[PDB]
Every structure is written in structure tokens, then in C-alpha cells.
Design goal:
The structure is a monomer. With about 60 residues, the protein is mainly beta. The protein has one domain. The chain contains no helices and five strands. The protein is globular, with a radius of gyration of 11 Å. The termini are close together. Its main location: secreted. This is Cytotoxin 13. It comes from Naja naja (Indian cobra). It is found in: Secreted.
Length: about 60
């Protein structure tokens, strides 16, 4: 898997065990993501922190 980095111009290949890409938002998915990369498990949404995960190259 390849996943976009914080500015999705750049990207990396995920290490072993991380087969999701993610975007992390402060409060709302209608904002500039505040973190991006590879991840093992898609974290649960919380009151102020939202995660969008996906499983294809550079989907984040």
C-alpha cells in the first residue's frame, strides 16, 4: 500500500501490518486534514476527532 502524507503531493509505502490509508480531521471532514498516513485499524470517530480510512493506493 501507498498512502498520501500530510500534503498529499507526497506519499510513502506503508510498512508491514498497515494496509489502510487515513485522513484525520479536527471536528469535521469538511476541513484540511491535520494528519495522514498508513494505519493498521481505522480508529473510531470521537466528538472532536474524525477519521476517514480507505484501502487503495493514495486514497487519503
Amino acid at each position: 500500500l501507498k498512502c498520501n502524507k500530510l500534503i498529499p503531493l507526497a506519499y510513502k509505502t506503508c510498512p508491514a501490518g498497515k494496509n489502510l490509508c487515513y485522513k484525520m480531521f479536527m471536528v469535521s471532514n469538511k476541513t484540511v486534514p491535520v494528519k495522514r498516513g498508513c494505519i493498521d485499524v481505522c480508529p473510531k470517530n470521537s466528538l472532536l476527532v474524525k477519521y476517514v480510512c480507505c484501502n487503495t493506493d493514495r486514497c487519503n
